[PDB]
Amino acid sequence: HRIEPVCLIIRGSPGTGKSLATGIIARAIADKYHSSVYSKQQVVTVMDDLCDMSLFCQMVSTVDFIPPMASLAEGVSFTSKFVIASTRFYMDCDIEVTDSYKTDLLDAGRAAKLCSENNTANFKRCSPLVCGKAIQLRDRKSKVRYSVDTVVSELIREYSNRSAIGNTIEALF
Amino acid sequence: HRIEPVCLIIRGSPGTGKSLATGIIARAIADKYHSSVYSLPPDPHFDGYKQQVVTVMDDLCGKDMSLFCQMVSTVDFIPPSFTSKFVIASTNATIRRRFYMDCDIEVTDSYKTDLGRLDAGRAAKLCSENNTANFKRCSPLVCGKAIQLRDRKSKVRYSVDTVVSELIREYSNRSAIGNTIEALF
Amino acid sequence: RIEPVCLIIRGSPGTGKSLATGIIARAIADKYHSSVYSLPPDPDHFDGYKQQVVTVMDDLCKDMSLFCQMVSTVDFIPPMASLAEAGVSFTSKFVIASTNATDSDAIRRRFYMDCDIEVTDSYKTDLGRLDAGRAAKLCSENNTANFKRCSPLVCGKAIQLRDRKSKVRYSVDTVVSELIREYSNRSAIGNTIEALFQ
Amino acid sequence: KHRIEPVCLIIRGSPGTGKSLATGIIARAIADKYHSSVYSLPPDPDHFDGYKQQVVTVMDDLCQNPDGKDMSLFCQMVSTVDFIPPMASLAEAGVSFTSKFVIASTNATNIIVPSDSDAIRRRFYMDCDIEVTDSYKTDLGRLDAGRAAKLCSENNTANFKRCSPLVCGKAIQLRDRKSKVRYSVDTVVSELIREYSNRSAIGNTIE
């Protein structure tokens, strides 16, 4: 059977543009792993607007899982290393828009620009959406804040330790 | 309905290593496809059948093969459904449209016993080198040193590894286009 | 017998020319409640041929000596590999074949329809070939005469054929209508003649 | 009354991968270095008619499938022991086999070693798979001989008067199964020549 997939769910109110986070997050994870995002044995699968829970609980597990397809059968057991959800959770995070980057009533127009400096970890270029300047993440069963860049740093680190240990443990048996 | 699974039947005498061959063959094919291997009993119900990519039919001996003509069929099956892509079987010393390959297993004199059977103890002990496609290390069973499969039609002798690679290619052949075709019907 | 109606589909590798013959044979076999016999490349025997309505000859290039025999009104008794199924006559109503990029008249006649496969630019991958994976995606809508569910392969979105003589454009669905129609009209002629003499 | 074992190359490959071109060219070049010629053994050989002690004998399609007559012939040619091969006509009967090199080819996966396996594989000095590169690949995944034959503009070889993609590696390579090292026609010639120059230096330093 399989390593449990590391998974990040993003809780927030509409207009926070959470899909802008799970998108930026998944892409940046599928690149490191030279892959794409699924929304064919992809690395990351994005599950946006999660109310679904029987289908989730069957992805994020250690069992072997075969998901339904429209086409009959067709080599496809679910193997995605990461699951990013927006609404088993390695991380469980609240979305927070800095008041500065809020519209009259999130202001993506302003929140998406290129800061002069590029001090990122996982992005070829920097922005307020990844520098933490415009948007932050807080685990709720741990009181740590993240930027888009540092949450993707965490999730790659955690998958790596889980794989090393989880792989040599299964060898024991 | 389905693409008829590729099937190999390994014919051999006793002491020839039939179920070492079939064992290893189906298990390497599984490992490629992130699946496992259902061991059908000799004189076979289908308890434990959990849509494994491969199922091994040992000591084919008729009760047995009226069930085989259903497993290796293009139509569907609900065994006392069956979606395994591969069937590896083995029979006595001495329908066939279903056998994609039909191999006589054969032991090299070097790994023969004094009583003229395979020397599995030694044959099982690993070789240092790996000129192999489907295994992370080989033994004289995978490499043709101890165990070889001679196609009955071709009359040619192959190693287990190369006959593996051929069962995977002949299914990738069926699989490419034929999958979306039925998806349409 | 009634000369089977033949479609040859000419296309370079990658334009998806055996998706076409595959779907076309399968769709004509269903309409006629049969199946499809696929005749292997460089055929020596016809071993699974139990009188399916459609036989497919992919990658036809010993090929045209055969091809000449199947697509005619003369009696063909193909060679079998097992005696247990020998002696039967070749009676498929349709022969769908595909071949390479581009006596000679001896064949040209056999083709009721001689088509080129085209790949729409929208479904053309980087390397100038069919976008195989995208084109299988079912369509929301099914405006087809012959299929239970539509797809860019069936209706005209990914691939289309074009008769070389007539220049008509066709989709997999429309070409199916065109082959069936022709057989209906051949069967209709031949029937009324054998109705006057049985 | 015996001799230095000929340095032997076997080339394994699917048909239509340049296998017989490669044997052709390696033989001819090696033959050029030693100012001799190529004797080509026929398939399923019965008799060596035409074998005039050429430095290289080529043995294409070793072990076509019939009955193993080929591996017994090959074990006699590639040995230290004297060998007087049969001939159809009496006009050239009695000549000893004295090729310094023997180049053979066969299919990709067939096992030609019958029985006494470990001693046979020793005779092969190099036991190579033939691979076409993917630019020179063509539909059906086989070699496009026409293009692979256009003369290269450069000649970096060690052994050829002129160079084409069959010679320098651009179109066809060989990989030594045991060493996993990739070679072109040009560099496996140099290896074969170095190994023979090696065996002659020994024999004569010991005698």
Add this chain to the structure above:
Amino acid sequence: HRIEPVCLIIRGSPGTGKSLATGIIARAIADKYHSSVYSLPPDPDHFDGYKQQVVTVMDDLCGKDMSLFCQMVSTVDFIPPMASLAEAGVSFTSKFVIASTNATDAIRRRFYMDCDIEVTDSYKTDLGRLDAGRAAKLCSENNTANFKRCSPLVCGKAIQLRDRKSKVRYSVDTVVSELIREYSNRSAIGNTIEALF
């Protein structure tokens, strides 16, 4: 050395056309290469007149003939006997050898094709012979690959040729097309090799 020439043999009883087939086959082939035919006499002794013609013919091959035949169809230089000191010296470099012989080890290996010749029933004379006059009479339609006018001798209506290993049938026209194909192969191969050295 030289490319072994591709060789065809036409086994047939007398008056089954066997000698017309070799002449027609050899002439057409020689025409395609812009050359002529050198025809060995029966019970050949010498090669007088041989000027390295693309094709040489050998009829009633019955061993003087054999030992002789076996050196023509080879890789190894064969300078054949002359009866005129002025001619002698020439090596044998013909690209094809066409031969015929009587009704019924290592030789069989040198025949690139080996054929029984067949007179079709229609054209059999009153007693199991070729009706040469009528078979020579020309055809109105011309579907041959290698003659500018057609005739039963060439398209397969009069005489046919049956290969004894492949059991395949040929007309004079088609066997001329196999042979030209089979030299083109060898030609092409040994060509790129020679170009390189």
Add this chain to the structure above:
Amino acid sequence: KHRIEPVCLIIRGSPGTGKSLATGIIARAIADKYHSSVYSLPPDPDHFDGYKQQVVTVMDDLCQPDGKDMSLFCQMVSTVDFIPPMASLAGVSFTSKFVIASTNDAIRRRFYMDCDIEVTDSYKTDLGRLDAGRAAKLCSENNTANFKRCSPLVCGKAIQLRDRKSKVRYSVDTVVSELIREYSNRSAIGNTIEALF
């Protein structure tokens, strides 16, 4: 030892009249018929590198001046053998069956046709030159003799070629049909003599 003179076509136009679209497509259609390809000479050329005896060779911008192009041209279009320059020391006699050239005594006798290009005013920009973006939209119908699919370039809708010597207008597809007819006629000539005898 000498060659059927290739048939030539020159397309005299101001630049921006799809002069280049015209020669490009014309050359490809002809080469696709003869199962070959097209060798494009750079304008004001010096070497023929890449020449492999493509059936069609193209000669963009003829007389751009100083006689460079024209001595090259008179040699390509002739009966006398021709060995063009190579800049890579790379058998390359010039043997192309057609020469399509575009520009801006014994010379004007080698032209088979000698044509002005002409946009039709339905497809003229406000600034005077071919609206390429519209002219390359595929036509739905295909009445052409030499194409898989039709375009106002192929077709005569957007681009036309008028012979100066005779006053016949042409489309890409019908000039293609005339040029082929001419070439096959010149190779008929050997076959038509042989017919009368």
